[PDB]
């Protein structure tokens, strides 16, 4: 088939940035129109890369003035040390701006099919910010793959709690 | 006889009755209970509720009556929400009249009342604010009323 897999030759995709192939084993791109799922994939991969760099960069031990972390999960100490400061409310609220103001009509550009549904502009780079053919696709695959490994790797960075109850640096100090 | 309400005795008996009767529910919970905090805020909403009726006229029942003469000592009871209310439904009436005399001359007026032209609707929604001297200036123009519309036999 067109897939480097069992069999489904080009169900609806095939030109998307799968450099190793188009994966798609289950019937989502059968009926979901694929532009919605692409905007969801890219938005999840961006926010998951922010999540994993959040967990690691916080596990390098930095606070203005707060408690000892011992974790970056488990809501009261970390999360509701932050909420009771009256502090995460705005860091949610500005994203409540961002998605409704510049993500919702952006998603309307993901309605009509005139977007390439990532693309919030945003290349503040010289000598390497190619919007064209080569580096846009092979770097968009970089954002895509590092975002997917950010999704799963953030999955493990959450789920090392039961036999650990410690930091992931302390998980590296354990076997 | 309309006593001033801040010194009516049976009125203050209703104060003692609702504060204490509502406090009978407060005798179930501990000092940090959210229910108990809600009845703290509720007792606040009873003492404020009764101190903010200090200029009404609660008669022999201890219940705050009103006055609709426009005495100007009781204008805050009725005539000020009267003028306020007639402003609000003169707004609504003027918006509805202006919008209907828009869509009376469109392509498909039957479709215009199902599917509101939110362009022209929210044009008139806001534009009917100065309706006393817009109806007074359309009424002098011979445009507010009509003449020789439908009627039955005789």
């Amino acid at each position: 088939p067109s897939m480097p897999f069992l069999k489904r030759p080009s169900k609806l995709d095939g030109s998307l940035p799968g450099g190793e192939g188009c994966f798609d084993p289950l019937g989502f791109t059968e009926v979901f129109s694929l532009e919605w799922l692409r905007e969801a994939e890219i938005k999840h991969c961006r926010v998951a890369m922010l999540a994993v760099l959040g967990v690691i960069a916080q596990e390098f031990g930095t606070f203005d003035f707060y408690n000892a972390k011992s974790k970056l999960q488990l809501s009261p100490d970390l999360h509701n040390q932050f909420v009771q400061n009256g502090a995460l409310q705005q860091i949610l609220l500005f994203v409540c701006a961002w998605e409704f103001i510049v993500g919702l009509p952006a998603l309307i550009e993901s309605v009509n099919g005139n977007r390439e549904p990532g693309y919030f502009g945003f290349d503040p780079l010289k000598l390497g910010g190619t919007v064209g053919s080569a580096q846009w696709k092979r770097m968009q695959a970089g954002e895509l793959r590092n975002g997917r490994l950010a999704m799963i790797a953030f999955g493990g960075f959450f789920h090392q709690q039961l036999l650990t109850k410690q930091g992931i640096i302390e998980q590296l100090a354990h076997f | 006889v309309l006593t001033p309400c801040q010194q009516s005795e049976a009125f203050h008996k209703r104060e003692i009755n609702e504060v204490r009767t509502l406090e009978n529910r407060q005798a179930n919970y501990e000092a940090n209970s959210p229910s108990y905090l809600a009845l703290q805020s509720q007792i606040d909403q009873v003492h404020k509720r009764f101190d903010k009726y200090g200029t009404l006229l609660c008669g022999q029942d201890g219940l705050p009556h009103l006055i609709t003469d426009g005495d100007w000592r009781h204008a805050r009871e009725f005539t000020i929400p009267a003028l306020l209310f007639l402003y609000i439904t003169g707004w609504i009436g003027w918006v509805g009249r202006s919008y209907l005399k828009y869509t009376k001359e469109t392509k498909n007026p039957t479709e215009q009342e199902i599917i509101l032209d939110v362009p022209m609707a929210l044009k008139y929604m806001l534009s009917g604010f100065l309706w006393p001297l817009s109806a007074w200036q359309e009424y002098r123009s011979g445009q507010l009323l009509a003449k020789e519309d439908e009627i039955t036999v005789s």
Partner: protein, 741 residues
């Protein structure tokens, strides 16, 4: 034969036709030149058998709409599990159920209505549940709030599968009619797959969740030392202590040594006197009996393998001589029209719901259900009213089949139209039975009314007066007393305590008492026989005279919702098959109003109430039925006046919302009457006399303001008569028994 033939990518999923209201009907996409276009937009919104005659497109529309209904039901049940999770005192209720009144909904604190938050114990207030969800959850074995949050989450997930399901089955994979008229397979999968695997897998839940948990709660363990339901399946050693038959595994099952499963499964009946509900051993054994018996029942329909029946060769073989042709034709009747199937399924669904109501008062199946009487009351009452309305839908949709989808060619001399050949002899003997039962069911109340009013109480129909002891009900009730030793041989206790032995007291509250039926209960049963025969008179008159009456010999040409024919024949107002459904809804309100008034007053005099020491008895009304149900002054005084005292004195207290739903539901009731008595020939030029006052000020509405149509203008009178009249009894019942139970 059997195969799956499904069109893919049928209807585009654009929002384009939302901008054309009334796109669906070619008789209605003209646009509103009148306001009657508005209301006909909604009454024709689900005439799926009246958009287009093509049964394929209709059948796609309905089968996709079902998933919308199940989407709303899963949103609703996920609402109940989340309101049980976040808002309820269920974890506190699980500690002591007989003390803490059940509540979920915690009213937002705005002006005054914070007084509706009833202090129901559990350290948290809110308006009290009478739906009895907590008794369903203790039977389910839900321990802490996490299973309620998770099951609400799965409720939303199944709601998403139903929205995406119906979207997927109208638009981008929608089946052919050959898929729909595969009815041997539809029964073959509902009798087995839906109901069979439902009851079997539910027996799996009850055995591996509810039996260990509601053994631990029957011992009285707080829900902290109880392990997870989960943690009973990882090892049998947590269940072999509770039931030692789990130690033997499934080996006594496959060796047919089913004596060994007497611990898990049994046939006891009665009620567990600790929890006041059924023994869940009996209930799990019960669902295994529905399991094997329905899974056997599924395999009687030949689909692909030439093994089983078809419906055709069954129905054609019942060619009895008094019908002549036999059932030749019904398989073509019931596989081409949907209103016929809706008549049957609504009739059996509603009557099943009444059966549900009776089997929930007299065999209370949930733990601590008969100890909080409002949940005991209203779960009787509510399944009566959907138990009622769904019957009238039968009388609607058996009428509609006779009007719309009837066809005399396929339906010639069979069992169906041979009724219509003597429908005068049907309706005439319903007419005689209605008058005979009306005299002998209500004239007894006027009789005892006068004899008590004339002083001659010896001439009444009391206990002491001319007795009318119901002989047959007392006799077969005595057979049910003599059940568990004689004929139900392997039983231990009776089928219920509404039949036999001494009552069940659970926390000084009477679970079930042996109901005595004497000489007043007789006459209320003849009320019920009467008002069931009147609705059967109107709803068989609405089906047999649905198509060609001898008054109007073309109703099939006029339609189903026509108002009338005219003033000719001396006036033929309210003559359609719809109009008999219009009357069957009022008589529904009558028949069920006196079913529940029979319930909620005989079971406040002969069952419910409290007990004191030395086994003493104390009902809520205190035995005040048989001396007082025989009249109507005793009825209206001792029930509708005396039981109002806890509804009417409810102001200032937490029941006061019912005191608002008592008055306003009177309002809506009387507000119905304006639509019933008047007619649109008044309102149309009353309205047009107001249209003069808009044309004078140029506020002429472009959509021309007609009055309501006749069938609408009476349909709204029914729909306020039932909301007002039903919500009066709703707030009267729940305001009555919460102040006691």
């Amino acid at each position: 034969q059997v195969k799956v033939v499904v069109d893919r990518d049928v209807v585009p999923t654009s929002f384009e036709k939302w901008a054309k209201p009334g796109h669906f009907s070619r008789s209605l996409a003209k646009g509103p030149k009148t306001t009657t276009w508005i209301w006909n937009l909604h009454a024709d919104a689900h005439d799926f058998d009246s958009h287009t005659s093509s049964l394929e497109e209709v059948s796609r529309k309905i089968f996709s709409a079902h998933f919308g209904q199940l989407a709303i039901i899963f949103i609703w049940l996920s609402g109940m599990y989340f309101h049980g999770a976040r808002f309820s005192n269920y974890v506190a209720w699980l500690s002591n159920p007989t003390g803490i009144k059940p509540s979920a909904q915690v009213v937002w604190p705005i002006v005054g209505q914070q007084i509706l938050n009833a202090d129901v114990g559990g350290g948290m207030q809110g308006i009290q549940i009478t739906s009895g969800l907590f008794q369903l959850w203790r039977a389910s074995g839900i321990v802490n709030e996490l299973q309620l949050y998770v099951t609400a989450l799965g409720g939303l997930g199944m709601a998403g599968l139903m929205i995406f399901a119906g979207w997927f089955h109208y638009h981008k994979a929608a089946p052919k009619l050959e898929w729909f008229q595969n009815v041997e397979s539809m029964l073959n999968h509902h009798l087995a797959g839906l109901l069979g695997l439902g009851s079997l897998s539910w027996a799996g839940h009850q055995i591996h969740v509810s039996l260990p948990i509601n053994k631990l709660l029957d011992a009285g363990v707080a829900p902290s030392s109880i392990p997870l339901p989960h943690e009973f399946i990882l090892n049998r050693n947590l269940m072999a202590e509770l039931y030692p038959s789990f130690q033997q595994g499934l080996v006594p099952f496959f060796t047919l040594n089913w004596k060994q499963y007497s611990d898990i499964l049994t046939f006891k009946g009665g009620l567990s006197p600790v929890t006041g509900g059924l023994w869940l051993t009996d209930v799990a054994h019960h669902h295994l009996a529905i399991a094997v018996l329905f899974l056997v029942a599924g395999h009687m329909y030949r689909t692909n393998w030439g093994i089983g029946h078809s419906i055709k060769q069954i129905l054609e073989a019942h060619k009895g001589p008094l019908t002549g042709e036999g059932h030749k034709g019904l398989y073509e009747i019931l596989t081409t029209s949907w209103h016929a199937n809706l008549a049957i399924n609504l009739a059996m669904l509603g009557s099943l719901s009444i059966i549900v109501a009776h089997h929930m008062y007299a065999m209370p199946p949930y733990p601590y259900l008969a100890t909080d009487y409002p949940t005991q009351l209203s779960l009787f009452t509510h399944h009566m009213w959907i138990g009622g309305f769904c019957i009238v839908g039968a009388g609607a949709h058996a009428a509609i089949y006779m009007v719309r989808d009837y066809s005399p060619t396929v339906n010639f001399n069979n069992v169906l139209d041979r009724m219509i050949r003597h429908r005068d002899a049907i309706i005439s003997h319903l007419n005689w039975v209605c008058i005979f039962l009306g005299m002998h069911s209500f004239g007894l109340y006027i009789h005892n009314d006068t004899m008590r009013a004339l002083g001659r109480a010896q001439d009444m129909f009391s206990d002491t007066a001319i007795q009318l002891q119901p002989v047959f009900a007392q006799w077969i009730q005595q057979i049910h007393t003599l059940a568990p030793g004689n004929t139900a041989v392997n039983a231990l206790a009776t089928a219920s305590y509404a039949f036999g032995a001494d009552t069940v007291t659970v926390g000084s509250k009477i679970a079930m008492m042996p109901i005595k039926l004497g000489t007043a209960d007789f006459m209320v049963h003849h009320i019920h026989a009467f008002t069931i025969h009147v609705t059967t008179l109107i709803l068989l008159k609405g089906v047999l005279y649905a198509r060609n009456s001898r008054l109007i010999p073309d109703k099939a040409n006029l339609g189903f919702r026509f108002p009338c024919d005219g003033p000719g024949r001396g006036g033929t107002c309210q003559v359609s098959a719809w109009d008999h459904v219009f009357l069957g809804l009022f008589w529904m309100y009558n028949a069920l109003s006196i079913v529940i008034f029979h319930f909620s007053w005989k079971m406040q005099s002969d069952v419910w109430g409290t007990v004191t020491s030395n086994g003493a008895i104390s009902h809520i009304t205190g035995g005040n039925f048989a001396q007082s149900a025989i009249t109507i002054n005793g009825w209206l005084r001792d029930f509708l006046w005396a039981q109002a005292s806890q509804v009417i004195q409810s102001y200032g207290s937490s029941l006061s919302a019912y005191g608002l739903m008592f008055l306003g539901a009177h309002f809506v009731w009387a507000f119905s009457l304006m639509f019933l008595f008047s007619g649109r020939g008044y309102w149309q030029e009353l309205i047009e006399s107001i249209v003069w006052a808009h044309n004078k000020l140029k506020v002429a509405p472009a959509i021309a303001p007609r009055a309501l149509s006749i069938t609408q203008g009476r349909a709204v009178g029914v729909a306020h008569y039932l909301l007002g009249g039903i919500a009066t009894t709703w707030a009267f019942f729940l305001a009555r028994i919460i102040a006691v139970g």
